[PDB]
Structure 1
Amino acid sequence: AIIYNPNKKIFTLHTAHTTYQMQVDPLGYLLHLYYGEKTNSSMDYVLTYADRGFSGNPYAAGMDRTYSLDALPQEYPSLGTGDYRNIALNIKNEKGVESADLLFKSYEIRNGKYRLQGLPAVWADEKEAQTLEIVLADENAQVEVHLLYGVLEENDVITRSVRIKNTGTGQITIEKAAAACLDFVQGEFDVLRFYGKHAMERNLERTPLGHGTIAFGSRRGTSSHQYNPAVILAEKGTTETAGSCYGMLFVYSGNFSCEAEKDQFNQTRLLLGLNEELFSYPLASGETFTVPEVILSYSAEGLSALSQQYHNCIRNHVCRSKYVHMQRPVLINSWEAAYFDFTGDTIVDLAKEAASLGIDMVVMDDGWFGKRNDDNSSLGDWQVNETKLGGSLAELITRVHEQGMKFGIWIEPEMINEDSDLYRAHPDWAIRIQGKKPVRSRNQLLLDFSRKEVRDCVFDQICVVLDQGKIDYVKWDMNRSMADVYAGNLSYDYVLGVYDFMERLCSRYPDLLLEGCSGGGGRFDAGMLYYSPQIWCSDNTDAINRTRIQYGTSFFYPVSAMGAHVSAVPNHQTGRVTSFHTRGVTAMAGTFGYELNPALLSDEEKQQIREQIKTYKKYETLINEGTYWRLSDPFTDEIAAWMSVSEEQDHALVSVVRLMAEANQATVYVRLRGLKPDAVYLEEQSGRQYSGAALMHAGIPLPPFTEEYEAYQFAFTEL
């Protein structure tokens, strides 16, 4: 629900269990009053006013020294109001002045959920959602700012976006534009962020917010491996199952900044949106710019509920693929199996092997195009290497279909190698600075996807390939960060180009299962999930490390989105050995699939594949649609444990991987969550029965281990 009280100038947003409230003050500033547990109260009483030294006053406050935007909580604070905190908006006007001082002009409440020009965004119908659009303006900056709030009641989600219009005659530049700001007048908080590196993404870092700013971001042209565009502000003491916590998730696959600051008056400001760095976005007279969306949510009941709200929102209101609600073929991918050393016959052999085991699809990964026999050539030359494939792609696809298997293929359309026909013809299509030799990364360069002619060339090549036969699946990868950034519009316009190509591709090929990739999880974000219902979670396929990566990814993203494959050992990234069974349990917390040559496996491991596939298919709906619960913290605990529970709470699958081993082992219990306390549950394999209450308070004892890194799955059914 969205309500306006014209007398108090208060806007109230209600979801099923939360309330967000704002107010236009007597000077026209849009103040933030409240976000938290549902309330019908007017929360304007929380605002207080004192003469605070060096916190100065709008001219319009006259002699009232107690009124300062350096103290007051705001929906969209800006540089140019006298506020000295981190701010959401900076405009440099047609005369060179960095100032924006925004006052209320108008509003509208609409049924349904706004969409964003050229960008992914949460979607819903007119019954499920309402939109509030508030217009603010600065007559001196000659800017008009449209704040968009989307309210999805059942999901306990509030979205925010911004449109900025130049209302003057001269060009302005947008120098900083956040999507969302939460201003807290009170509270002690921790900041949870998800950091990492290539092949080890999304480690949880949780620290108290001390005085000053905790900040993180990306200027890589991508959402990045290093810091995901996501933040949780947890009240001190909040756990998985209790206490207040607030999320912000950026629906965007490019650059971002997140800032959390505890100020001089013990107030907290949280910002998420575009990066200020390499962002100086020109806006001509009468033109509008759109800031990408942030999804906000609140839980009074701990982190697990917060995550569940995000999982539901992403599956049902971000991902557009039919595969959200359909079985997804179990695939085998050629990359760790063969790298570049394959032929068409190799690929068909992989199909034959995989068909005998119950695998549904073979994905031919990198190495099929140009003269791509290593990673030093041929990006941009999306012509099939028929010498290597021993014939045409059409014929290969048919040979694979004759084995009863679907076919998938890898592409990397944003990129170019110097050693390519495309680069010899069009070296100026690479992103570069004139006269400067560019950074190389994996011995490749980015194509300038801000340019239509560049995108069209590559799009046409990709269409020729995909039109050769029935291709069920595409893995779209992106293997380096952006450098040599030549202008202040490029980071943003590049990503608009990517999304345009991706929308064109999905529209032309609407039955395709698109898996996003960027050296693993380098663009693991809700912007990508709007197009691809799964993303390759990491190039690290070590089961033990995957427990941490998958744990971290689960704070915002649903299991169904996490690409996860059983790979060979010793693992190719870590050198560690794990049992086949543990690799299976871990990879079932995601898309499942295989990425190895099964011909090298023992008969016993081949039979394990058969049984794994039967297990995954049996529990696929539960894993993908069920309510997810983290049952341990793999950074600190003896085990990595998680579970999925059906909507009706009548079925659950519990997964456990042991992380530590010593002699004379203590008994380890796994405590379950999300069950009905008074219901009785049957554990399948053992045939023992337990109450929900028992399973949640005492849990179940794990069988004693006899080897390292053992794993378990337990299935419970309500009697």
Structure 2
Amino acid sequence: AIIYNPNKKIFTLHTAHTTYQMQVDPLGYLLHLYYGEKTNSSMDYVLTYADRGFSGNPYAAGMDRTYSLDALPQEYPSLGTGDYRNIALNIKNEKGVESADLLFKSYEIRNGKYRLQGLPAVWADEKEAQTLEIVLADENAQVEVHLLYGVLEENDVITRSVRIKNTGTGQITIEKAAAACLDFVQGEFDVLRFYGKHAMERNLERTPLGHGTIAFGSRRGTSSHQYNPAVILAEKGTTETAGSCYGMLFVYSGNFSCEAEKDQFNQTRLLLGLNEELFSYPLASGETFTVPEVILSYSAEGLSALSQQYHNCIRNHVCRSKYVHMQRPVLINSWEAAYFDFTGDTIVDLAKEAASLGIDMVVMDDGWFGKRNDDNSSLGDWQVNETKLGGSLAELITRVHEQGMKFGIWIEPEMINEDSDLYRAHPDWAIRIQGKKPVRSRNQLLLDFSRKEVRDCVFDQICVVLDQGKIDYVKWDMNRSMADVYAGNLSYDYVLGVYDFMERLCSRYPDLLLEGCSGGGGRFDAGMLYYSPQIWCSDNTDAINRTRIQYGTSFFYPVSAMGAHVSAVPNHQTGRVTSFHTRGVTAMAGTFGYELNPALLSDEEKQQIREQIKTYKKYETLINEGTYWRLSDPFTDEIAAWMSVSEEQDHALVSVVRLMAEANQATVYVRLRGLKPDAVYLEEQSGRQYSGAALMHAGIPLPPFTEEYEAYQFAFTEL
């Protein structure tokens, strides 16, 4: 629900269980009053006013020294109000002046959910959602700012976006543009963020917010491996199952900045949006710029509920793929299995092997195009290497189909190698600075996807390939960060170009399952999930590391979105050995699939694959649609444990991987969550019956281990 009280100039946004409230003050400033548990009260009483030294006053406040935007909580604070905190907006006007001082002009409440020009965004129908659009302006800056709030009641989600219009005659530049700001007049908080590196993404870091700023972001041209564009502000003491917490999630696959600051008056400001670095975005007279969307959510009852709200929002209101509500083929991917050393014949052998085990699809990964026999050439040359494939791609697809198998293929359309026909023809199509030798990464360069001519060339090549046969799946990879950034519009316009290509591809091939990828989870974001129902979660396929990566990824993203494959051991990234069973349990927390040559496996491991596939298919709907619960913290605990629970709470699958081993082992219990306390549940394998209360308070004792890194799955059915 969205309500306006014209007398108090208060806007209230209600979800099923939350309330967000803002007010236009007598000077025209849009103040933030409240976000938290549902209330019908007017929360303007929380505002207080004192003469605070060096916190100065708008001219319009006259002699009232107690009114300062350096103290008051705001919806969209800006550089140019006298506020000295981190700010959401900085405009450099047509005379070089950095100032924006925004006053209320008008509003509209609309049924349904706004869409964003050229960008992914949350979507919903006119019954499920409402939109508030508030117009603010600064007549000296000659800017008009449209704040967009999307309210999805059942999901307990409030989205925010911004459109900025130049209303003057000369060009302005947008120098900083956040999508969302939360100002808290009180509270002690921790900041949860998800940091990592290539092949070890999204480790949880949780620290108290001390005085000053905790900040993180990306200027890599991508959302990044290093810091995901996501933040949780948890009230001190909040746990998985109790206490207030707030999320912001950026629906965006490019650069970003997140800032959380505890100020001089013990107030907290949380910002998320575009990075101000390499962002000086020109806006001509009368033109509008759109800031990508942030999904906000609040939980009064801990982190697990907050995550569940995000999972549901992403599955049902971000992902547009038909595969959200369909079985997804269990695939085998050629990359760890063969790297570049394959032929058409060895792809068909992989299909034969995989077919005999119950695998549904073979994915021919990197190495099939140009003269790509290593990673030093051929990106941009998306012509099938028929020498290597021993014939045409059409013939290969048919040979695979004849083994009863679907076919998928890898592409990397944003990239070019110096050693390519494309680069020899068009060296100026690479992102570079004139006169400067560019950074190389994986011995390749980015194509300038801000340029239509560049995108069109590559799009046409990819269409020729995809039109050769029935290709049910594409893995779209992206294997380096952007450098040599030549202008202040490039980072943003590059990503517009990526999304344009992706939209064109998905529209042309609406039955295609598109798996996003960027050296693993280098663009693991809701922007990509708008197009792809799954993203390769990490290049690290070590089961033990995957417990951490998948744990961290679950704070915002649904299990269904996490690409996860059983791979060979010793693991190619770590050298560690894990049992085949443990690899299977860990990879079932995601898409499932395989990425190895099954011909090298023992007959016992081949039979495990057969049984694994049967297990995953049996539980696929539960894993993908069920309510997810983290049952342990793999950074600190003896086990990595999680579970999925059906909507009716009549079925649950519990997964456990042991992380630590000593002699004379203590008994370890796994405590379940999300069941009906008074219901009786049958554990399938053992045939024992337990109340939900018992399972949640005492849990179940794990069988004693006899080897390292042992794993378990337990299924429960309500009687």
TM-score, normalisation: structure 2: 1.00
Using the TM superposition, give the Cα deviation of residue 207 of structure 1 relative to its aligned residue in structure 2, in angstroms.
Answer: 0.0
Using the TM superposition, give the Cα deviation of residue 610 of structure 1 relative to its aligned residue in structure 2, in angstroms.
Answer: 0.1
Q: Hey, what's the Cα distance between the residues in 2 that align with 1:426 and 1:95?
A: 38
Using the TM superposition, give the Cα deviation of residue 348 of structure 1 relative to its aligned residue in structure 2, in angstroms.
Answer: 0.1
Using the TM superposition, give the Cα deviation of residue 436 of structure 1 relative to its aligned residue in structure 2, in angstroms.
Answer: 0.0
Using the TM superposition, give the Cα deviation of residue 47 of structure 1 relative to its aligned residue in structure 2, in angstroms.
Answer: 0.1
Using the TM superposition, give the Cα deviation of residue 116 of structure 1 relative to its aligned residue in structure 2, in angstroms.
Answer: 0.0
Report Cα offsets for 1:648-692 as digits up to 9, x if no partner: 000000000000000000000000000000000000000000000
Using the TM superposition, give the Cα deviation of residue 403 of structure 1 relative to its aligned residue in structure 2, in angstroms.
Answer: 0.2
Using the TM superposition, give the Cα deviation of residue 231 of structure 1 relative to its aligned residue in structure 2, in angstroms.
Answer: 0.0
Using the TM superposition, give the Cα deviation of residue 142 of structure 1 relative to its aligned residue in structure 2, in angstroms.
Answer: 0.1
Report Cα offsets for 1:325-353 as digits up to 9, x if no partner: 00000000000000000000000000000
Partner of residue 580, structure 2: 580
Report Cα offsets for 1:221-241 as digits up to 9, x if no partner: 000000000000000000000
Q: Hey, what's the Cα distance between the residues in 2 that align with 1:620 and 1:455?
A: 37
Q: Secondary structure at the match of 1:682?
A: strand
Using the TM superposition, give the Cα deviation of residue 201 of structure 1 relative to its aligned residue in structure 2, in angstroms.
Answer: 0.0
Partner of residue 589, structure 1: 589
Using the TM superposition, give the Cα deviation of residue 700 of structure 1 relative to its aligned residue in structure 2, in angstroms.
Answer: 0.0
Q: Hey, what's the Cα distance between the residues in 2 that align with 1:250 and 1:309?
A: 15
Q: Hey, what's the Cα distance between the residues in 1 that align with 2:266 and 2:246?
A: 18
Q: Secondary structure at the match of 1:455?
A: helix
Using the TM superposition, give the Cα deviation of residue 614 of structure 1 relative to its aligned residue in structure 2, in angstroms.
Answer: 0.1
Q: Secondary structure at the match of 1:249?
A: strand
Q: Secondary structure at the match of 1:231?
A: strand
Q: Hey, what's the Cα distance between the residues in 2 that align with 1:328 and 1:335?
A: 20
Q: Hey, what's the Cα distance between the residues in 1 that align with 2:468 and 2:159?
A: 41
Q: Hey, what's the Cα distance between the residues in 1 that align with 2:67 and 2:546?
A: 51
Q: Hey, what's the Cα distance between the residues in 1 that align with 2:401 and 2:254?
A: 37
Q: Hey, what's the Cα distance between the residues in 2 that align with 1:535 and 1:296?
A: 22
Partner of residue 344, structure 2: 344
Report Cα offsets for 1:155-194 as digits up to 9, x if no partner: 0000000000000000000000000000000000000000
Report Cα offsets for 1:544-600 as digits up to 9, x if no partner: 000000000000000000000000000000000000000000000000000000000
Q: Hey, what's the Cα distance between the residues in 2 that align with 1:140 and 1:533?
A: 45
Partner of residue 555, structure 1: 555
Q: Hey, what's the Cα distance between the residues in 2 that align with 1:512 and 1:457?
A: 21
Q: Hey, what's the Cα distance between the residues in 2 that align with 1:322 and 1:464?
A: 24
Q: Secondary structure at the match of 2:442?
A: coil
Using the TM superposition, give the Cα deviation of residue 58 of structure 1 relative to its aligned residue in structure 2, in angstroms.
Answer: 0.0
Using the TM superposition, give the Cα deviation of residue 616 of structure 1 relative to its aligned residue in structure 2, in angstroms.
Answer: 0.1
Q: Secondary structure at the match of 1:460?
A: helix
Q: Hey, what's the Cα distance between the residues in 1 that align with 2:399 and 2:558?
A: 35
Report Cα offsets for 1:590-633 as digits up to 9, x if no partner: 00000000000000000000000000000000000000000000
Q: Secondary structure at the match of 2:501?
A: helix
Using the TM superposition, give the Cα deviation of residue 645 of structure 1 relative to its aligned residue in structure 2, in angstroms.
Answer: 0.0
Using the TM superposition, give the Cα deviation of residue 295 of structure 1 relative to its aligned residue in structure 2, in angstroms.
Answer: 0.0
Partner of residue 102, structure 2: 102
Using the TM superposition, give the Cα deviation of residue 131 of structure 1 relative to its aligned residue in structure 2, in angstroms.
Answer: 0.0
Using the TM superposition, give the Cα deviation of residue 98 of structure 1 relative to its aligned residue in structure 2, in angstroms.
Answer: 0.0
Q: Hey, what's the Cα distance between the residues in 1 that align with 2:472 and 2:611?
A: 24
Q: Secondary structure at the match of 1:90?
A: strand
Q: Hey, what's the Cα distance between the residues in 2 that align with 1:54 and 1:287?
A: 37
Q: Secondary structure at the match of 2:572?
A: coil
Report Cα offsets for 1:103-140 as digits up to 9, x if no partner: 00000000000000000000000000000000000000
Q: Hey, what's the Cα distance between the residues in 2 that align with 1:337 and 1:33?
A: 56
Using the TM superposition, give the Cα deviation of residue 440 of structure 1 relative to its aligned residue in structure 2, in angstroms.
Answer: 0.0
Partner of residue 321, structure 2: 321
Q: Hey, what's the Cα distance between the residues in 1 that align with 2:468 and 2:672?
A: 49
Q: Secondary structure at the match of 1:348?
A: helix
Q: Secondary structure at the match of 1:634?
A: coil
Report Cα offsets for 1:521-565 as digits up to 9, x if no partner: 000000000000000000000000000000000000000000000
Using the TM superposition, give the Cα deviation of residue 370 of structure 1 relative to its aligned residue in structure 2, in angstroms.
Answer: 0.1
Q: Secondary structure at the match of 1:395?
A: helix
Q: Secondary structure at the match of 2:216?
A: strand
Report Cα offsets for 1:75-97 as digits up to 9, x if no partner: 00000000000000000000000
Using the TM superposition, give the Cα deviation of residue 287 of structure 1 relative to its aligned residue in structure 2, in angstroms.
Answer: 0.0
Q: Secondary structure at the match of 2:312?
A: helix
Q: Secondary structure at the match of 1:399?
A: helix
Q: Hey, what's the Cα distance between the residues in 1 that align with 2:241 and 2:322?
A: 32
Q: Secondary structure at the match of 1:660?
A: coil
Q: Secondary structure at the match of 2:175?
A: strand
Q: Secondary structure at the match of 1:140?
A: coil
Q: Hey, what's the Cα distance between the residues in 2 that align with 1:381 and 1:451?
A: 18
Using the TM superposition, give the Cα deviation of residue 425 of structure 1 relative to its aligned residue in structure 2, in angstroms.
Answer: 0.1
Report Cα offsets for 1:34-91 as digits up to 9, x if no partner: 0000000000000000000000000000000000000000000000000000000000
Q: Secondary structure at the match of 1:617?
A: helix
Q: Hey, what's the Cα distance between the residues in 1 that align with 2:304 and 2:587?
A: 21
RMSD: 0.1
Q: Secondary structure at the match of 2:304?
A: helix
Q: Secondary structure at the match of 2:584?
A: helix
Q: Hey, what's the Cα distance between the residues in 2 that align with 1:311 and 1:514?
A: 19
Q: Secondary structure at the match of 2:113?
A: coil
Q: Hey, what's the Cα distance between the residues in 1 that align with 2:457 and 2:472?
A: 23
Using the TM superposition, give the Cα deviation of residue 450 of structure 1 relative to its aligned residue in structure 2, in angstroms.
Answer: 0.1
Partner of residue 156, structure 2: 156
Using the TM superposition, give the Cα deviation of residue 512 of structure 1 relative to its aligned residue in structure 2, in angstroms.
Answer: 0.2
Q: Hey, what's the Cα distance between the residues in 2 that align with 1:532 and 1:327?
A: 15
Q: Hey, what's the Cα distance between the residues in 2 that align with 1:200 and 1:234?
A: 24
Q: Hey, what's the Cα distance between the residues in 2 that align with 1:467 and 1:281?
A: 38
Using the TM superposition, give the Cα deviation of residue 463 of structure 1 relative to its aligned residue in structure 2, in angstroms.
Answer: 0.1
Matched, 1:145 2:145: yes
Partner of residue 233, structure 1: 233
Partner of residue 132, structure 1: 132
Partner of residue 425, structure 2: 425
Q: Hey, what's the Cα distance between the residues in 2 that align with 1:305 and 1:338?
A: 42
Q: Hey, what's the Cα distance between the residues in 1 that align with 2:300 and 2:623?
A: 25
Q: 5+ unaligned residues in a row in structure 1: which ranges?
A: none
Using the TM superposition, give the Cα deviation of residue 211 of structure 1 relative to its aligned residue in structure 2, in angstroms.
Answer: 0.0
Using the TM superposition, give the Cα deviation of residue 705 of structure 1 relative to its aligned residue in structure 2, in angstroms.
Answer: 0.1
Q: Secondary structure at the match of 2:271?
A: strand
Using the TM superposition, give the Cα deviation of residue 393 of structure 1 relative to its aligned residue in structure 2, in angstroms.
Answer: 0.1
Using the TM superposition, give the Cα deviation of residue 9 of structure 1 relative to its aligned residue in structure 2, in angstroms.
Answer: 0.0
Percentage of pairs with the same residue: 100
Q: Hey, what's the Cα distance between the residues in 1 that align with 2:686 and 2:31?
A: 58
Q: Hey, what's the Cα distance between the residues in 2 that align with 1:319 and 1:226?
A: 24
Matched ranges for 1:250-649 at <5 A: 250-649=250-649
Q: Secondary structure at the match of 1:541?
A: coil
Q: Secondary structure at the match of 2:16?
A: coil
Q: Secondary structure at the match of 2:264?
A: coil
TM-score, normalisation: structure 1: 1.00
Report Cα offsets for 1:428-450 as digits up to 9, x if no partner: 00000000000000000000000
Report Cα offsets for 1:471-526 as digits up to 9, x if no partner: 00000000000000000000000000000000000000000000000000000000
Q: Secondary structure at the match of 2:532?
A: coil
Q: Hey, what's the Cα distance between the residues in 1 that align with 2:469 and 2:90?
A: 50
- Please list every run of at least 4 consecutive aligned residues from structure 1 whose deviation after the TM superposition is greater than 2 angstroms: none
Q: Secondary structure at the match of 2:178?
A: strand
Q: Hey, what's the Cα distance between the residues in 1 that align with 2:42 and 2:179?
A: 25
Report Cα offsets for 1:246-287 as digits up to 9, x if no partner: 000000000000000000000000000000000000000000
Q: Hey, what's the Cα distance between the residues in 2 that align with 1:323 and 1:466?
A: 19
Using the TM superposition, give the Cα deviation of residue 297 of structure 1 relative to its aligned residue in structure 2, in angstroms.
Answer: 0.0
Using the TM superposition, give the Cα deviation of residue 417 of structure 1 relative to its aligned residue in structure 2, in angstroms.
Answer: 0.0
Q: Hey, what's the Cα distance between the residues in 2 that align with 1:560 and 1:513?
A: 13
Partner of residue 211, structure 1: 211
Q: Secondary structure at the match of 2:488?
A: coil
Aligned residue pairs, count: 719
Q: Hey, what's the Cα distance between the residues in 1 that align with 2:344 and 2:206?
A: 48
Using the TM superposition, give the Cα deviation of residue 210 of structure 1 relative to its aligned residue in structure 2, in angstroms.
Answer: 0.1
Using the TM superposition, give the Cα deviation of residue 212 of structure 1 relative to its aligned residue in structure 2, in angstroms.
Answer: 0.0
Q: Hey, what's the Cα distance between the residues in 2 that align with 1:436 and 1:300?
A: 53
